[PDB]
């Protein structure tokens with residue numbers, strides 16, 4: 727419910743150097759539920775995900791979907807992740823139709839990661855700094 731409890735600490739939650747390029751950054755939260763899913767994966771020279779970190783803030787459904795998602799990107803390549811869909815996730819966690827926002831949240835995070843990382847590969851410098 728609204729009153730978020732403090733406990734059941736997550737696992738493997740440690741954002742990566744967002745100041746680098748080899749590691750993309752994907753942050754996707756929920757406007758209604760009010761969540762903050764910060765995903766970050768480190769891509770090697772070959773283009774394979776060697777490191778993956780997820781950080782969810784809000785409802786559990788989000789923390790779970792992520793923890794599981796970020797675990798699927800590990801060992802896989804940026805290309806593979808792009809294939810990863812939310813439908814499967816929702817089923818894996820077996821979340822209700824009310825906590826769907828989370829399911830999609832995971833996928834959105836994954837892509838944002840690889841994508842953002844690619845943007846730097848295609849454009850070293852640009853008019854935007856952010």
Ligand SMILES: [Zn+2]
Nearest residue numbers: 759761785788
């Ligand atoms: Zn939520």
